[PDB]
Amino acid sequence: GMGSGLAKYLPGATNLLSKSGEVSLGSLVGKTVFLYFSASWCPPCRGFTPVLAEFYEKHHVAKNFEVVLISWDENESDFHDYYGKMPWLALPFDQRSTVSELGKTFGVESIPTLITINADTGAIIGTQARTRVIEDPDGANFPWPN
């Protein structure tokens, strides 16, 4: 077992959904993590997700980060379909009861929203990456601290 600073905000979470199966929070040691508050049916999310996917494909290795979907979907089949087409990780559907309070904790007032977190400490690096990705597509100023 390995600890994780993400457990500061996901104390009920252990595994994340991934394209390789499941990954522990501990597996993200040393990384920058983006919590991506989104939903399958939200129109502005539909416009943003491909932009974030392109950024992810380009930079996630060289800039040592992961993206974890935090979905507002309340329908499990919709959740899996939506996440299936993304390239990154997801908080499992069985954590859906925590999503509202997690949004409140980070001052999420609408979606899409990105919250940038240090995986080791749980420190919030930034809250504006949803726009910075568009402003800075090659991530010159990543991870966009204030």
Ligand X SMILES: Cc1nc2scc(-c3ccc(F)cc3)c2c(=O)[nH]1
Tokens of 107: 């001052």
Binding mask 97-136 for ligand X (x = CB under 6 A): ------x----xxxx-------------------------
Q: Letter for the amino acid at 92?
A: P
- Tell me the number of residues near ligand X by CB under 6 A: 8
3-state secondary structure of 89: strand
Rounded to whole angstroms, how far apart are CA atoms 52 and 60?
11
Site for its own copies in 68-127 (CB under 8 A): 74-75, 78, 100, 109-110
Number of Cβ atoms within 10 Å of the Cβ of 1: 5
The smaller minimum CB distance to ligand X, of residues 23 and 124, is found at 124
Interacting residues with its own copies (CB under 8 A): 41-44, 74-75, 78, 100, 109-110
